[PDB]
């Protein structure tokens, strides 16, 4: 499927990287009003964080030209003036972070696209996590949703837990990496004050729906999840601390097993398992949704555990993007 | 009272500085055998985390001189051979983190102390946190434990939350600054495989018997709660984060209310309270014990609730030393 | 003299924050008109790298209040709409940095101010560097610079040592912290691609006008000097590397000689010497325009030294503001 | 030629990834007493900096398995102790830290080693720098030097400047990485009291032989270049900044050209050339020696120039020890 990509940030680059390393999907129009086409070209090819681009990217005939393939360059700030149809852009990865709506991300589907992936939590748009509850998706759904990274860590391990031994109530907590919303010293924000802080200096403390959210995609699980995450300065890798209360009584070995056998089943390269005294770099790029820390976690009782799970938000939750893509294409 | 102080380290050296700046007591004798005079002169007048120290500090006649007062140096690897009566040391603060048994701390006993109190968590001492079970102390105890910093974080808390609603059951992560026991880059060590890795690049997991701890003083939540860590690239502040079943309902107004009475009251200067968009930052050199974030935590019901607390490790804790020095001192 | 401040970000409030400490000008007057009243008093009560603001600060009836002085806000984008002439603002402190020129900072005339002092490098506002070329203002000069932090750190060190050896020809390279105008994260940046990539992550390299600026300070210095920045992940302290050919011999200890008694003398308060092993955070919150390391520095003959001086970049360039405007008043 | 690597730490790790990446030596040995099997397996196959080790790495039968290749595993605290003959280790990367003379280094030819290769800067033995003076090697030198990082970094910028201009006298300044040797926080060093504050922290001033050291392998530059370092907060990536007096006139155009031609030519893959905004993250991994900066450098005139040239500290230098192994192995 041919994929237009609105927004050269963290997440729309890093879709587009996802994208041309796996080979899953092509990438032929990209829209960013800010970014110009050289700068495209030095902003995908040099990346602090996941290493240079291997592969080839230039800048031809007004062109962004990644492994030899041409994509369209748009520089619109309306997205309806996008001509997604005419570069040919079936499906558009609203990746800007303010068209998180129906008819906001619906401007897309006017400039010709057929369907759009919103790849933030959205407020109306239908929300699916790859391996929780994406075969709810159907093709008479033209706006999706892909949900939050955190989301994409929290919902698969949520879901192997309340599958085997029933989710009373969890509280999750988020220790996240620094993300591009965040300053580096001491800056106005117009209401989350805790997030003007400077981001390398700080503990930050954020609200979060992602835990909520997972109520969303695991309906047996709304209201009983939520949650609150501690910003930190790192700058990729993220963690989930899930502290839950079991329905039925699961020792942490039992719990480690079923992870495990979800790990390598049908959650296989969606839900991560190790057992390993990993750190945070050994996530880097890593394109899990969530691995589970087997180590890292501790239970008080039968009853009542605390669950670790890591994950690379920026590379993941691309990963989890371009699967979505697949699906919706593979669902045509 | 007049107090020696084995080692001088962050907090060997952030404890003479809390005794000095609050004039509590008296230090007279430094035992440290890795730090010459003039270099325990540099190390106590500059501080990266806590800025450099308000008054005077030089060396003199093999003597280190703050604000006018002469404090004997001593150089020995062994406790029994430093003459802590001599130089009149009627208390010891066992701060090198290698002798926290009663057997070890006894040594000090050897040279003329009166008494030992050690810094660190203990598997036999006595253990007291101020405003908590410090009043369980009594002058035939020789050697005492002031716990961890992130016991006298949590236990106030704990304390307060258990006596009005009843703790079922909790679960804690702290959200650790770097300590000296980590790595600059991926190093060895003994067992903990994860302190060995790169403190700046990483978010790194850990055990900590604090959270158990709290059973030791608050007798009633013996066995009701455990924990983990996480530690973070920060130098200094931290944060711990408690997620318990209450045993009485609690809407979160409740909580926050019965929290800030108990800081304005017998816990006032022990445990803080504040409704601010605090970070890290905000708490450095913060001299309690454990402060309060009420817009931090979140609720998922009257039953299950996360409350988060922030806590220099360093400042904090050094001055829970020398409360609880100053109150077996009025004990005597 | 009653002061002005067009904006609230790090120069403006540690200006405010300068000017309170030491009480040599009265702040009666604030626009920004991006941070509203009880924002502004958040930002100003807690800073992460100076710590929390000694004394009080709250609203009042539309005014923020610090230690009991009503000071008007005022929300204004256009400089020309502010009335500075009815809060009584003689003198403004123009540190938005998009007013650095003499007709953009005149538009505080317009609005009732006597004169406007600009916290950044002008164009063409005459530059001023306290104890450099201070005394070279007169009272009729209404808008003047107070040049740049890295400047206010090079020039008074440029002008000891090319007064007492001549600085025939000198490079700079400023070690600087990070400041607002990095991404936390990879991000997007107009023309300066460099300073869009994670300030935490990287080692930046920066252009900066600075040591060329010094020639305007001091004209015999006009073009023999110019460098370079390279921007490092810490939040505060920067420090200035020069490497000059100098017309007369000087071994490294008259050099450091000559600098101490400049640093006594009639530069006290603004060129400090240190010969102790000093690192960054040792001058944190420091209010010299730069202090000499002598130990840190290295010489390779007699006429090609290489010479260090650190300098908090916030604190004591928003001293130098205070100073200054402290100085034009006295000229009145 | 099989090689055996005494020290399991940065440079040992490092320099066995780069064997096996680069397939140049055979790895047959390594010794290491504080690390055993195990914790080597982990070591090896986790990096925080350089991500996961690509290949597979595990214990079996006592041996460190590599990509299938079995390396023996020495746990000795004296060289002369090693068996490195009975390994069939011909050459021994010295890679320990504390070995770094000749009579210390040939303990190794005691245990079988049938030459020598120091990885660290050496007080007596015969210093090679890849590109710059390697072809000065003969097969009667038993134990050799591969100087620093830092002065691979240099020495090959050195050569071309000196051999197209001619460097009457140079002053270096290395913004640094942090390093093993640092302190997570403020803590006891031995004699460098600055090595022990904080790394991640501050901004640290540090004396380096490494442009002396160019000299011994110039030796026409010998007396004619000095510097110091400033150690960072940053994990891997550090940058050479050499400021130079020319003894023939340049124009910065002409020293870009003549790097270029350099970089393209007989230096290619030690000397790195770019004209891109480049930060520090943009080489980690990155095997050369020395990258130059064009755009980052300036020129006061064409007789007094600023040069810029990065390098991964870590990567660079093991992918060089490398390299003079594989030309000593050809020079046999
Ligand atoms: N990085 C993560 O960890 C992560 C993971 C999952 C989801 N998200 C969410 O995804 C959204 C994207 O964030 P990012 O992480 O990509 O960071 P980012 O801020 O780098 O990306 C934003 C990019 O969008 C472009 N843009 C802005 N307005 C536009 C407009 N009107 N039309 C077109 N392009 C426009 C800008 O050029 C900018 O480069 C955010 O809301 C973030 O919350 C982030
Ligand atoms: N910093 C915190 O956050 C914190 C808070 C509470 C408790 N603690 C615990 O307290 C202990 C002290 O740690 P720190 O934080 O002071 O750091 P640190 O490692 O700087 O202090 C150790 C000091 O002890 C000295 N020393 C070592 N062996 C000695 C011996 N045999 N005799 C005498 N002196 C000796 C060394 O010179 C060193 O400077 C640790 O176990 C730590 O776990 C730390
Ligand atoms: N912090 C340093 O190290 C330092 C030192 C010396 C000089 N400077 C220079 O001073 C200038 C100020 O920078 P800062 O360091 O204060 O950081 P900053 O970016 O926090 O300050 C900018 C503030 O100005 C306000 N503002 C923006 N547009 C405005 C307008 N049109 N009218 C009124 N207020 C407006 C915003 O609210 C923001 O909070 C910069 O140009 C910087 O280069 C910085
Ligand atoms: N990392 C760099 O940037 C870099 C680059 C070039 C050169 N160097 C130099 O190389 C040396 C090695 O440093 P690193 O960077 O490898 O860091 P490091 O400190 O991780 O390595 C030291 C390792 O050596 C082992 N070791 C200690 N004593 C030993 C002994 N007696 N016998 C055998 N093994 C022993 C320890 O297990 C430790 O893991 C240092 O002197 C450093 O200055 C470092």
């Known amino acids: 499927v041919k994929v237009g990509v609105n927004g050269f940030g963290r997440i729309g680059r890093l879709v587009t990287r996802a994208a041309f390393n796996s080979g899953k ?3 032929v129009a990209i829209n960013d009003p800010f970014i110009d086409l050289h700068y495209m070209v030095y902003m995908f090819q040099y990346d602090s964080t996941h290493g240079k681009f291997n592969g080839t990217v230039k800048a031809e005939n007004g062109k962004l030209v990644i492994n030899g393939k041409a994509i369209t360059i748009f520089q619109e700030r309306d997205p309806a003036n996008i001509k997604w149809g005419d570069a040919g852009a079936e499906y558009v990865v609203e990746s800007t972070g303010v ?3 129906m008819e906001k991300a619906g401007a897309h589907l006017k400039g010709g696209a057929k369907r759009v992936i919103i790849s ?3 407020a109306d748009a239908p929300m699916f996590v790859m391996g929780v509850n994406h075969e709810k998706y159907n093709n008479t759904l033209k706006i999706v949703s892909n949900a939050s990274c955190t989301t994409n860590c929290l919902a698969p391990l949520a879901k192997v837990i309340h599958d085997h031994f029933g989710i009373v109530e969890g509280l999750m907590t988020t220790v996240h990496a620094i993300t591009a ?3 580096t010293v001491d800056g ?5 004050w805790r997030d003007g ?3 390398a200096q700080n503990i930050i403390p954020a609200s979060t729906g992602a835990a909520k959210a997972v109520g969303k995609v695991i309906p047996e699980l709304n209201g009983k999840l939520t949650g609150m995450a501690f910003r930190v300065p790192t700058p990729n890798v993220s963690v989930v601390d899930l502290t839950c209360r079991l329905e039925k009584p699961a020792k942490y070995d039992e719990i480690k097993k079923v992870v495990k056998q979800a790990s390598e089943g049908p959650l296989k390269g969606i839900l991560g398992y190790t057992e390993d005294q990993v750190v945070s770099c050994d996530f880097n790029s890593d394109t899990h949704s969530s691995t589970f820390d087997a180590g890292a976690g501790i239970a008080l009782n039968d009853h009542f555990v605390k669950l670790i799970s890591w994950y690379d938000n920026e590379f993941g939750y691309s990963n989890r993007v371009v699967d979505l893509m697949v699906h919706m294409a593979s669902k045509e």
Not at 188 to 192: D, E, F, N, T
Request: aromatic share 4%.
């Open 25 to 27: 999907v092509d990438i």
């Open 99 to 101: 068209f998180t709506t």
């Open 120 to 122: 933030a939590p959205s």
């Open 181 to 183: 919303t965040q300053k």
């Open 188 to 192: 106005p924000s117009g209401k989350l």
């Open 197 to 199: 802080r400077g981001a």
